[PDB]
Write a protein that binds this DNA or RNA. Structure first.
Ligand SMILES: [Br-]
Ligand SMILES: [Zn+2]
Ligand SMILES: [Zn+2]
Ligand SMILES: [Zn+2]
Ligand SMILES: [Zn+2]
Lengths: 79, 73
DNA sequence: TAGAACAAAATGTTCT
DNA sequence: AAGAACATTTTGTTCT
């Protein structure tokens, strides 16, 4: 267990509840805090991996949610 | 009137094709620079004004296929 | 019409 | 672990 669950690159730790690399960490934070009105140019199942994760922010963010990322994971594991 | 690659607003005829300024500039960069664009779908993404930034592989392919060529005039 | 430059958006890394 | 600040990459506009 040492892979990012969103893009399958090398995980750098748990962030927002999920083992992810640092790039998905800050992507998710930015997506959750701001606008994430993204539009898939395919069929909403683009392949999110180390080279292609730049391609589709819409599917990357759905992959984050699917993997379970959530901003209040910190205060969550406190319960 | 409208870009042949991404359906944005065509600014004129660039490298052989009626394209927009985004696509014009994207095209030169694609062929001159070196990157390896890989499609994350099915090699058939939708390239419109918003989605053109998502898949440079498909955008680039659309460019070539629409006849864009650095050598034209 | 093409380039250059400039500017902005989107992604990723370091935190001596 | 979470997040700021820094840094890069990628895209788009404008002014030659
Ligand atoms: Br920078
Ligand atoms: Zn990742
Ligand atoms: Zn997608
Ligand atoms: Zn275009
Ligand atoms: Zn594509």
């Amino acid at each position: 267990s040492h892979m990012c669950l969103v893009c399958s690159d090398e995980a750098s730790g748990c962030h927002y509840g999920v083992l992810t690399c640092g790039s998905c960490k800050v992507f998710f934070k930015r997506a959750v805090e701001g606008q994430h009105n993204y539009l898939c140019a395919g069929r909403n199942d683009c392949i999110i991996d180390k080279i292609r994760r730049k391609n589709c922010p819409a599917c990357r963010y759905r992959k984050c949610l699917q993997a379970g990322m959530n901003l209040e994971a910190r205060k969550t594991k406190k319960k």
